[PDB]
Amino acid sequence: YDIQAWKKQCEELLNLIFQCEDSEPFRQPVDLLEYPDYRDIIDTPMDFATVRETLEAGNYESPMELCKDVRLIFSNSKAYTPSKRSRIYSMSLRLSAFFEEHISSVLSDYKSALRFHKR
Ligand SMILES: O=C(O)c1ccc(Cl)c(Cl)c1
């Protein structure tokens, strides 16, 4: 019932994501020189370094907020992809499945801890 445990759990999960080859296109903001029309389609860029920095700055209040920003990385890749078969989009799908598989217990434990706190 540790209400703060999610933060280190998210740091460790981000470490695993940064080790995944599939995260390379998503570690830093999308390069506008390589994809000049990016901001015409994507309103809110997001990347894993921004997520990690936000977490480390103490600017997430809950793992739900972190999860919303990670999911935005994946929805931006889906919105920008020219094809559902593209290389970068396929990497995003594998990374999303890995992230969802690991974030589920983090969210469950946090929500359970809050409910215990307010019992
Ligand atoms: O060229 C592509 O397939 C491509 C380039 C950049 C992104 Cl973010 C995505 Cl999802 C796809």
Q: Is 110 in the pocket of ligand 1 (CB under 6 A)?
A: no
- How remote is the CA of residue 84 from the centroid of ligand 1, in Å? 10
Helices (H) and strands (E) in the chain, counts: 5, 0
Angle at which helix 63-80 crosses helix 6-19, to 10 degrees, equals 30
With beta carbons less than 8 A apart as the criterion, state whether 45 and 29 touch.
yes
CA of 96 to the centre of ligand 1 (A): 15
Instruction: Assess whether the C-beta atom of 80 lies below 6 angstroms from ligand 1.
Output: yes
**Interatomic CA distance for residues 36 and 52, integer angstroms:** 26
Tokens (6 digits) for 28: 């830093």
Ligand 1 binding pocket includes 77 (Cβ within 6 Å):
yes
Q: Give the number of other CB atoms < 10 A from CB of residue 43.
A: 9
∠25-27-30 over CA atoms, to 5°?
60
Rounded CA separation 75/36 (Å):
19
Q: Are 72 and 32 in contact (CB under 8 A)?
A: no
Domain assignments of the chain as residue spans, ordered by start: 1-119
Going from the Cα of 57 to the center of ligand 1, the distance in angstroms, rounded, reads 29
Contact 96 CB / ligand 1 (< 6 Å): no
Among 52, 88, 83, CA closest to 70: 52
Residue 48: which of 78, 18, 86, 19 has the closest Cα?
Answer: 18
Residue type, 91: M
Cβ atoms within 10 A of the Cβ of 47, count? 19
Residue 107 CA neighbour count, 13 Å, CB half: 11
Residues 84-91: contacts with CB within 8 Å, 24+ apart?
A: 88/25, 91/21, 91/22, 91/23, 91/24, 91/25, 91/26
* Ligand 1 neighbour 6 (Cβ under 6 A): no
